[PDB]
Amino acid sequence: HQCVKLNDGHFMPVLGFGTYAPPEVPRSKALEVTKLAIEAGFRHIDSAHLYNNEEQVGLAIRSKIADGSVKREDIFYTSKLWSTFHRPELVRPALENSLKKAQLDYVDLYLIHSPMSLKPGEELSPTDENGKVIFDIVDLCTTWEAMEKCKDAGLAKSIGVSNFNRRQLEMILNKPGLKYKPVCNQVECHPYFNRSKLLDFCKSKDIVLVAYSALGSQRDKRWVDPNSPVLLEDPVLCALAKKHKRTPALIALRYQLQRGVVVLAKSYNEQRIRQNVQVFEFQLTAEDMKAIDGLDRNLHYFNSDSFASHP
Ligand SMILES: NC(=O)c1ccc[n+]([C@@H]2O[C@H](COP(=O)([O-])OP(=O)(O)OC[C@H]3O[C@@H](n4cnc5c(N)ncnc54)[C@H](OP(=O)(O)O)[C@@H]3O)[C@@H](O)[C@H]2O)c1
Ligand SMILES: Cc1oc(CN(C)C(=O)CCc2nc(C3CC3)no2)cc1C(=O)O
């Protein structure tokens, strides 16, 4: 197991547990699998207001504190500001609401979930008469200032962003009077979309890149074309899993660790959850890393359609 030091001095475990499940999955499952993830050795847990599970993820964390398995300081908990709450006066109340649902006094990391802003309101996915998502226009530098106040208040130990491109990161990094840089940029990253350019940019600014859909996404029918390639069926990943006596998923997770990327892995299955912690047990060679680097195909499992159809 291991951690990376963030640019604000805090530490982030390099393997994180992804908690999103689609709305057809009962919320009782998020509670159960987050306990399993902690039992298996995960200490970084990634949630969000969008996921409609912070109450269950927080109950799981509290349960594993109460049974003496971990202390609160051993757990790195992430939440995210949803895009209906970008207007600066909504940022601290959104964080306080997440804290009240999770029954936590602070989050380890609070992220701007997306640079695209949506109409303020109670709906996650506000839509007009024609079924189109209603966007909003917000100066994200003001959103960032409100996030910095949340860190100064102690409600978030660290603050960062998600789904930002280089230009959007530069807008923050170049803001006059910037007090805290983002510690991370959590973005889609896997061998079919390896983000090498953004990764080199983030390294030059001491910003950690955190990979999501590192196992190729849940292929949710709302947004993923069934005809897109299945990452875990890739022949290179399969050959490398055979060389190492591992699985394609483990190859995909270890790839990110060796290139300096913090990696998330969602699983709601006890055996796969426990399997993913084995990413610390083996190593890819430089040749194996070059082969995986050759898989890049600019394939995005997440695009603009992923803002719609959240009930
Ligand atoms: N906008 C954002 O910031 C953003 C976007 C997307 C995701 N995320 C975060 O990143 C997390 C992970 O991304 P993701 O939800 O797209 O899923 P993922 O980590 O790419 O995983 C995809 C699927 O892999 C399967 N899996 C896991 N371990 C496996 C193993 N050892 N062997 C075979 N299959 C395995 C899981 O199925 P089973 O459950 O059946 O095991 C999972 O549904 C999310 O849950 C969320 O926390 C953030
Ligand atoms: C279940 C779920 O859905 C989402 C979708 N969102 C809000 C994103 O920002 C994804 C990336 C994205 N890029 C774009 C540009 C329009 C091309 N549109 O969307 C995140 C999660 C999660 O697990 O966090």
CSV table of C-alpha atoms and ligand atoms in Angstrom, one decimal:
chain,number,residue,atom,x,y,z
A,1,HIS,CA,0.0,0.0,0.0
A,2,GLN,CA,1.2,3.6,-0.5
A,3,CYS,CA,0.3,7.3,-0.5
A,4,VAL,CA,1.3,10.4,-2.4
A,5,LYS,CA,2.0,13.8,-0.9
A,6,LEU,CA,-0.3,16.5,-2.2
A,7,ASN,CA,0.7,20.0,-2.9
A,8,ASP,CA,-0.9,21.2,0.3
A,9,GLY,CA,1.0,18.8,2.5
A,10,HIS,CA,-1.8,16.3,3.0
A,11,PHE,CA,-1.5,12.7,1.9
A,12,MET,CA,-3.6,10.6,-0.5
A,13,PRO,CA,-3.7,6.8,-0.8
A,14,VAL,CA,-2.8,5.8,-4.3
A,15,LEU,CA,-5.6,3.2,-4.7
A,16,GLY,CA,-9.2,4.4,-4.2
A,17,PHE,CA,-12.5,2.7,-4.0
A,18,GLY,CA,-15.1,3.9,-6.5
A,19,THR,CA,-18.6,4.0,-5.1
A,20,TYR,CA,-20.9,5.0,-8.0
A,21,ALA,CA,-23.6,2.5,-8.8
A,22,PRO,CA,-26.6,3.2,-11.1
A,23,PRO,CA,-30.0,3.9,-9.6
A,24,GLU,CA,-31.3,0.3,-10.1
A,25,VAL,CA,-28.7,-0.9,-7.5
A,26,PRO,CA,-30.3,-0.7,-4.1
A,27,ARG,CA,-28.7,1.8,-1.7
A,28,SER,CA,-28.1,-0.9,0.8
A,29,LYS,CA,-25.5,-2.3,-1.5
A,30,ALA,CA,-23.3,0.8,-1.3
A,31,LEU,CA,-23.3,0.4,2.5
A,32,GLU,CA,-22.3,-3.3,2.3
A,33,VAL,CA,-19.6,-2.9,-0.3
A,34,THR,CA,-17.9,0.1,1.3
A,35,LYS,CA,-17.5,-2.0,4.4
A,36,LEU,CA,-16.1,-4.8,2.3
A,37,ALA,CA,-13.7,-2.3,0.6
A,38,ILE,CA,-12.4,-1.1,4.0
A,39,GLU,CA,-12.1,-4.7,5.2
A,40,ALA,CA,-10.0,-5.5,2.1
A,41,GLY,CA,-7.7,-2.6,2.8
A,42,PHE,CA,-9.0,0.3,0.8
A,43,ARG,CA,-8.5,3.6,2.7
A,44,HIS,CA,-9.4,6.1,0.0
A,45,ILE,CA,-13.2,6.2,-0.8
A,46,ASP,CA,-14.6,8.2,-3.7
A,47,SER,CA,-18.1,9.5,-3.5
A,48,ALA,CA,-20.1,12.6,-4.6
A,49,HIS,CA,-23.5,14.3,-4.1
A,50,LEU,CA,-24.4,13.0,-7.6
A,51,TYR,CA,-24.1,9.4,-6.5
A,52,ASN,CA,-27.1,9.4,-4.0
A,53,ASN,CA,-25.0,7.3,-1.7
A,54,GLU,CA,-23.1,9.6,0.8
A,55,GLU,CA,-25.4,8.5,3.7
A,56,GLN,CA,-24.5,4.8,3.0
A,57,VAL,CA,-20.8,5.4,2.4
A,58,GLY,CA,-20.6,7.5,5.6
A,59,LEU,CA,-22.5,4.8,7.5
A,60,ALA,CA,-20.0,2.2,6.3
A,61,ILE,CA,-17.1,4.4,7.4
A,62,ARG,CA,-18.7,5.0,10.9
A,63,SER,CA,-19.4,1.3,11.2
A,64,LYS,CA,-15.7,0.4,10.6
A,65,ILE,CA,-14.6,3.0,13.0
A,66,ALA,CA,-17.0,1.8,15.7
A,67,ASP,CA,-15.9,-1.8,15.3
A,68,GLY,CA,-12.3,-0.7,15.8
A,69,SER,CA,-11.0,-1.6,12.3
A,70,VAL,CA,-9.9,1.9,11.4
A,71,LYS,CA,-9.8,5.4,12.8
A,72,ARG,CA,-11.3,8.4,11.0
A,73,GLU,CA,-7.7,9.7,10.3
A,74,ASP,CA,-7.0,6.4,8.5
A,75,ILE,CA,-9.7,7.0,5.9
A,76,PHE,CA,-9.4,9.4,2.9
A,77,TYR,CA,-13.0,10.4,2.0
A,78,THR,CA,-13.7,12.4,-1.2
A,79,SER,CA,-16.9,14.1,-2.1
A,80,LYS,CA,-17.8,16.4,-5.0
A,81,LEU,CA,-19.7,19.6,-5.6
A,82,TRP,CA,-22.4,18.9,-8.1
A,83,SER,CA,-22.7,21.3,-11.1
A,84,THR,CA,-26.1,22.8,-9.9
A,85,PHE,CA,-24.1,24.3,-7.0
A,86,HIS,CA,-21.3,26.2,-8.8
A,87,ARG,CA,-22.6,29.6,-7.9
A,88,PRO,CA,-20.3,30.7,-5.1
A,89,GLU,CA,-23.0,31.1,-2.4
A,90,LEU,CA,-24.1,27.5,-2.9
A,91,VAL,CA,-20.7,25.9,-2.4
A,92,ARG,CA,-20.4,25.8,1.4
A,93,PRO,CA,-24.0,24.8,1.9
A,94,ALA,CA,-23.5,21.9,-0.6
A,95,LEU,CA,-20.5,20.7,1.3
A,96,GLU,CA,-22.2,21.1,4.7
A,97,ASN,CA,-25.1,19.0,3.3
A,98,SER,CA,-22.8,16.3,2.1
A,99,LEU,CA,-21.2,16.3,5.6
A,100,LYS,CA,-24.6,16.0,7.3
A,101,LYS,CA,-25.6,13.1,5.1
A,102,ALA,CA,-22.3,11.2,5.6
A,103,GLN,CA,-22.3,12.2,9.3
A,104,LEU,CA,-18.7,13.3,9.1
A,105,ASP,CA,-17.1,16.4,10.4
A,106,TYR,CA,-14.8,17.0,7.4
A,107,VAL,CA,-14.0,15.5,4.0
A,108,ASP,CA,-10.4,14.7,3.1
A,109,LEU,CA,-11.0,16.1,-0.4
A,110,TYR,CA,-13.7,18.2,-2.0
A,111,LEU,CA,-13.8,18.4,-5.8
A,112,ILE,CA,-15.5,20.5,-8.4
A,113,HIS,CA,-17.2,17.5,-10.1
A,114,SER,CA,-17.3,19.1,-13.6
A,115,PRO,CA,-16.4,22.5,-15.2
A,116,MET,CA,-19.9,22.6,-16.9
A,117,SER,CA,-22.4,24.4,-14.7
A,118,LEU,CA,-26.1,23.5,-14.6
A,119,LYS,CA,-29.2,25.5,-13.6
A,120,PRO,CA,-29.4,25.9,-9.8
A,121,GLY,CA,-32.2,23.9,-8.2
A,122,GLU,CA,-32.9,20.6,-6.5
A,123,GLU,CA,-32.8,18.5,-9.7
A,124,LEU,CA,-29.5,16.8,-10.5
A,125,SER,CA,-30.3,17.0,-14.2
A,126,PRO,CA,-32.5,20.0,-14.8
A,127,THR,CA,-34.3,19.9,-18.2
A,128,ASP,CA,-36.5,22.2,-20.3
A,129,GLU,CA,-39.8,21.4,-22.1
A,130,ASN,CA,-37.8,19.7,-24.9
A,131,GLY,CA,-35.9,17.3,-22.6
A,132,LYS,CA,-32.6,19.2,-23.0
A,133,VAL,CA,-30.3,19.8,-20.1
A,134,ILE,CA,-30.4,23.4,-18.8
A,135,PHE,CA,-26.9,24.8,-18.4
A,136,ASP,CA,-25.8,27.8,-16.4
A,137,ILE,CA,-22.9,30.2,-16.8
A,138,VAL,CA,-20.6,30.7,-13.7
A,139,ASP,CA,-17.2,32.1,-13.3
A,140,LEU,CA,-15.3,29.0,-11.9
A,141,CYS,CA,-12.7,31.2,-10.4
A,142,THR,CA,-15.5,32.4,-8.0
A,143,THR,CA,-16.4,28.8,-7.4
A,144,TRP,CA,-12.8,28.1,-6.6
A,145,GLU,CA,-12.6,31.0,-4.1
A,146,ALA,CA,-15.6,29.5,-2.3
A,147,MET,CA,-13.8,26.1,-2.2
A,148,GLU,CA,-10.7,27.8,-0.8
A,149,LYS,CA,-12.9,29.1,2.1
A,150,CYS,CA,-14.2,25.6,2.8
A,151,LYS,CA,-10.6,24.5,3.2
A,152,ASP,CA,-9.8,27.5,5.5
A,153,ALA,CA,-12.9,26.5,7.5
A,154,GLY,CA,-11.6,23.0,8.0
A,155,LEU,CA,-14.6,21.4,6.3
A,156,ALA,CA,-12.3,20.0,3.5
A,157,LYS,CA,-8.7,19.1,4.2
A,158,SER,CA,-7.8,19.4,0.5
A,159,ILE,CA,-9.6,20.8,-2.6
A,160,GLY,CA,-9.3,19.9,-6.2
A,161,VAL,CA,-11.1,19.5,-9.5
A,162,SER,CA,-12.5,16.9,-11.9
A,163,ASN,CA,-13.0,16.7,-15.6
A,164,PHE,CA,-10.9,19.9,-16.2
A,165,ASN,CA,-8.8,20.1,-19.3
A,166,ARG,CA,-5.5,22.0,-19.5
A,167,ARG,CA,-7.1,25.3,-20.4
A,168,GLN,CA,-9.5,25.1,-17.5
A,169,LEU,CA,-6.7,24.2,-15.0
A,170,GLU,CA,-4.7,27.2,-16.3
A,171,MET,CA,-7.6,29.5,-15.6
A,172,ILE,CA,-7.5,28.4,-11.9
A,173,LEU,CA,-3.7,28.4,-11.7
A,174,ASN,CA,-3.5,31.8,-13.2
A,175,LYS,CA,-6.2,33.4,-11.0
A,176,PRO,CA,-5.0,36.6,-9.2
A,177,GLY,CA,-4.8,36.1,-5.5
A,178,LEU,CA,-5.0,32.2,-5.8
A,179,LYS,CA,-4.5,30.8,-2.3
A,180,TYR,CA,-4.7,27.0,-2.9
A,181,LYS,CA,-3.9,25.2,-6.1
A,182,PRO,CA,-6.0,22.2,-6.8
A,183,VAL,CA,-4.4,19.1,-5.4
A,184,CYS,CA,-5.7,16.9,-8.1
A,185,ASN,CA,-7.6,16.6,-11.3
A,186,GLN,CA,-9.8,13.5,-11.4
A,187,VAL,CA,-10.4,12.6,-15.0
A,188,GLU,CA,-11.2,9.6,-17.3
A,189,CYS,CA,-8.0,7.7,-17.7
A,190,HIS,CA,-7.3,4.1,-18.9
A,191,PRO,CA,-5.2,2.5,-21.6
A,192,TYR,CA,-7.7,3.4,-24.3
A,193,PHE,CA,-7.5,7.1,-23.3
A,194,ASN,CA,-4.3,7.5,-21.3
A,195,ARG,CA,-4.2,11.3,-21.0
A,196,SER,CA,-0.4,11.4,-21.5
A,197,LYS,CA,-0.5,15.1,-22.4
A,198,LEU,CA,-2.7,16.2,-19.5
A,199,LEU,CA,-0.6,13.9,-17.2
A,200,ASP,CA,2.6,15.7,-18.1
A,201,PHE,CA,0.9,19.1,-17.6
A,202,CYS,CA,-0.3,18.1,-14.2
A,203,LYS,CA,3.1,16.7,-13.1
A,204,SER,CA,4.7,20.0,-14.1
A,205,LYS,CA,2.2,21.9,-11.7
A,206,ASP,CA,2.4,19.3,-8.8
A,207,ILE,CA,-1.2,18.3,-9.4
A,208,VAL,CA,-2.1,14.7,-9.0
A,209,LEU,CA,-4.0,13.1,-11.9
A,210,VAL,CA,-6.7,10.7,-10.4
A,211,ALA,CA,-8.0,8.2,-12.9
A,212,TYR,CA,-11.6,7.1,-13.1
A,213,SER,CA,-13.1,4.5,-15.4
A,214,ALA,CA,-9.6,2.9,-15.1
A,215,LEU,CA,-11.2,-0.5,-15.7
A,216,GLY,CA,-13.0,0.7,-18.8
A,217,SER,CA,-16.2,2.1,-17.1
A,218,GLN,CA,-19.4,0.4,-16.1
A,219,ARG,CA,-20.6,0.7,-19.7
A,220,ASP,CA,-23.8,2.2,-18.5
A,221,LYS,CA,-26.5,1.9,-21.2
A,222,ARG,CA,-27.5,5.5,-20.7
A,223,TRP,CA,-24.3,6.8,-22.2
A,224,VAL,CA,-22.0,4.1,-23.5
A,225,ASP,CA,-22.4,2.7,-27.0
A,226,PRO,CA,-22.5,-1.1,-26.6
A,227,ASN,CA,-20.3,-1.3,-29.7
A,228,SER,CA,-17.3,0.5,-28.1
A,229,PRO,CA,-14.3,-1.7,-27.3
A,230,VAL,CA,-14.4,-3.5,-23.9
A,231,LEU,CA,-11.1,-2.5,-22.2
A,232,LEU,CA,-10.8,-5.6,-20.1
A,233,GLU,CA,-11.0,-7.8,-23.2
A,234,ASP,CA,-8.0,-6.2,-24.8
A,235,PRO,CA,-5.5,-8.8,-26.1
A,236,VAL,CA,-2.5,-6.9,-24.8
A,237,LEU,CA,-4.0,-6.6,-21.3
A,238,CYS,CA,-4.9,-10.3,-21.5
A,239,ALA,CA,-1.3,-11.3,-22.6
A,240,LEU,CA,0.2,-9.3,-19.8
A,241,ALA,CA,-2.2,-10.8,-17.2
A,242,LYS,CA,-1.0,-14.2,-18.4
A,243,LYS,CA,2.7,-13.2,-18.2
A,244,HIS,CA,2.2,-12.0,-14.6
A,245,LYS,CA,-0.4,-14.5,-13.4
A,246,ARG,CA,-2.8,-11.6,-12.7
A,247,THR,CA,-6.0,-10.4,-14.4
A,248,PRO,CA,-6.6,-7.7,-17.0
A,249,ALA,CA,-8.1,-5.4,-14.4
A,250,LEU,CA,-5.0,-5.7,-12.2
A,251,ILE,CA,-2.8,-4.9,-15.3
A,252,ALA,CA,-4.9,-1.8,-15.9
A,253,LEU,CA,-4.7,-0.6,-12.3
A,254,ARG,CA,-0.9,-1.3,-12.0
A,255,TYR,CA,-0.3,0.6,-15.2
A,256,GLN,CA,-1.6,3.8,-13.6
A,257,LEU,CA,0.4,3.4,-10.4
A,258,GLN,CA,3.7,3.0,-12.3
A,259,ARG,CA,3.1,6.2,-14.4
A,260,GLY,CA,2.4,8.4,-11.3
A,261,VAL,CA,-1.4,8.3,-11.5
A,262,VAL,CA,-3.7,7.7,-8.4
A,263,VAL,CA,-6.2,5.1,-9.5
A,264,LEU,CA,-9.9,4.4,-8.6
A,265,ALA,CA,-11.6,1.1,-9.0
A,266,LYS,CA,-15.3,0.5,-8.6
A,267,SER,CA,-16.5,-3.0,-7.7
A,268,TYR,CA,-19.6,-4.1,-6.0
A,269,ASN,CA,-18.4,-7.8,-5.9
A,270,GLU,CA,-16.6,-9.0,-2.7
A,271,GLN,CA,-14.0,-11.1,-4.6
A,272,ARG,CA,-13.2,-8.4,-7.2
A,273,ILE,CA,-12.9,-5.8,-4.5
A,274,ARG,CA,-10.4,-8.0,-2.7
A,275,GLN,CA,-8.7,-8.8,-5.9
A,276,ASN,CA,-8.1,-5.1,-6.7
A,277,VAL,CA,-6.0,-4.6,-3.6
A,278,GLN,CA,-3.5,-7.1,-5.1
A,279,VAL,CA,-2.3,-4.3,-7.4
A,280,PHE,CA,0.4,-3.8,-4.8
A,281,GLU,CA,1.8,-7.3,-5.1
A,282,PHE,CA,3.5,-7.2,-8.5
A,283,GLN,CA,5.2,-5.0,-11.0
A,284,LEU,CA,5.1,-4.3,-14.7
A,285,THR,CA,8.4,-4.0,-16.6
A,286,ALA,CA,9.3,-1.0,-18.7
A,287,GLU,CA,8.6,-3.0,-21.8
A,288,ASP,CA,5.1,-3.9,-20.4
A,289,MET,CA,4.5,-0.2,-19.7
A,290,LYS,CA,5.4,0.7,-23.3
A,291,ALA,CA,3.0,-2.0,-24.7
A,292,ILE,CA,0.1,-0.6,-22.6
A,293,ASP,CA,1.1,3.0,-23.7
A,294,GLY,CA,0.5,1.7,-27.3
A,295,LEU,CA,-3.2,1.0,-26.5
A,296,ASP,CA,-4.2,4.7,-26.6
A,297,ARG,CA,-7.1,5.3,-28.9
A,298,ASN,CA,-8.7,8.5,-27.6
A,299,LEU,CA,-11.8,6.5,-26.6
A,300,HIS,CA,-14.0,8.4,-24.1
A,301,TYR,CA,-16.5,6.3,-22.2
A,302,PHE,CA,-17.8,9.6,-20.7
A,303,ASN,CA,-19.0,12.6,-22.8
A,304,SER,CA,-21.6,15.3,-22.7
A,305,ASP,CA,-24.5,12.8,-22.7
A,306,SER,CA,-23.4,11.8,-19.1
A,307,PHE,CA,-25.0,14.9,-17.6
A,308,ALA,CA,-28.5,13.7,-18.5
A,309,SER,CA,-30.6,10.9,-17.1
A,310,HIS,CA,-29.6,11.2,-13.4
A,311,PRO,CA,-32.9,10.9,-11.5
B,1,LIG,N1,-16.8,12.6,-13.2
B,1,LIG,C1,-16.0,11.9,-12.3
B,1,LIG,O1,-15.3,12.5,-11.5
B,1,LIG,C2,-16.2,10.4,-12.4
B,1,LIG,C3,-16.7,9.7,-13.5
B,1,LIG,C4,-16.8,8.4,-13.5
B,1,LIG,C5,-16.4,7.7,-12.3
B,1,LIG,N2,-15.9,8.4,-11.3
B,1,LIG,C6,-15.5,7.7,-10.0
B,1,LIG,O2,-14.6,6.6,-10.4
B,1,LIG,C7,-15.2,5.2,-10.0
B,1,LIG,C8,-14.7,4.1,-11.0
B,1,LIG,O3,-15.0,4.5,-12.3
B,1,LIG,P1,-16.3,3.6,-12.9
B,1,LIG,O4,-17.5,3.7,-12.1
B,1,LIG,O5,-16.4,4.1,-14.4
B,1,LIG,O6,-15.8,2.0,-12.9
B,1,LIG,P2,-14.4,1.3,-13.2
B,1,LIG,O7,-13.5,1.5,-12.0
B,1,LIG,O8,-13.8,1.6,-14.5
B,1,LIG,O9,-15.0,-0.2,-13.2
B,1,LIG,C9,-15.8,-0.7,-14.2
B,1,LIG,C10,-16.3,-2.1,-13.8
B,1,LIG,O10,-15.1,-3.0,-13.5
B,1,LIG,C11,-15.5,-4.1,-12.9
B,1,LIG,N3,-14.4,-4.5,-12.1
B,1,LIG,C12,-13.8,-4.0,-11.0
B,1,LIG,N4,-12.8,-4.8,-10.6
B,1,LIG,C13,-12.8,-5.8,-11.5
B,1,LIG,C14,-11.9,-6.9,-11.5
B,1,LIG,N5,-10.9,-7.2,-10.7
B,1,LIG,N6,-12.0,-7.8,-12.5
B,1,LIG,C15,-13.0,-7.6,-13.4
B,1,LIG,N7,-13.9,-6.6,-13.5
B,1,LIG,C16,-13.8,-5.7,-12.5
B,1,LIG,C17,-16.7,-3.6,-12.0
B,1,LIG,O11,-17.8,-4.4,-12.1
B,1,LIG,P3,-18.3,-5.1,-10.6
B,1,LIG,O12,-18.9,-4.1,-9.8
B,1,LIG,O13,-19.3,-6.1,-11.1
B,1,LIG,O14,-17.1,-5.8,-10.0
B,1,LIG,C18,-17.0,-2.2,-12.6
B,1,LIG,O15,-18.4,-2.0,-12.9
B,1,LIG,C19,-16.5,5.6,-9.9
B,1,LIG,O16,-17.3,4.6,-9.1
B,1,LIG,C20,-16.5,7.1,-9.3
B,1,LIG,O17,-16.2,6.8,-7.9
B,1,LIG,C21,-15.8,9.7,-11.2
B,2,LIG,C1,-22.0,8.5,-13.1
B,2,LIG,C2,-21.3,9.7,-13.5
B,2,LIG,O1,-21.7,10.4,-14.5
B,2,LIG,C3,-20.8,11.5,-14.6
B,2,LIG,C4,-20.9,12.5,-15.7
B,2,LIG,N1,-20.3,13.8,-15.6
B,2,LIG,C5,-21.0,14.7,-14.7
B,2,LIG,C6,-19.1,14.1,-16.2
B,2,LIG,O2,-18.6,15.2,-16.0
B,2,LIG,C7,-18.4,13.1,-17.0
B,2,LIG,C8,-17.4,13.6,-18.0
B,2,LIG,C9,-18.0,14.4,-19.1
B,2,LIG,N2,-17.3,15.1,-20.0
B,2,LIG,C10,-18.2,15.7,-20.8
B,2,LIG,C11,-18.0,16.6,-21.9
B,2,LIG,C12,-19.2,16.8,-22.8
B,2,LIG,C13,-18.1,15.9,-23.2
B,2,LIG,N3,-19.4,15.4,-20.2
B,2,LIG,O3,-19.3,14.6,-19.2
B,2,LIG,C14,-19.8,11.4,-13.6
B,2,LIG,C15,-20.2,10.2,-12.9
B,2,LIG,C16,-19.4,9.8,-11.7
B,2,LIG,O4,-19.3,8.6,-11.4
B,2,LIG,O5,-18.8,10.7,-11.1
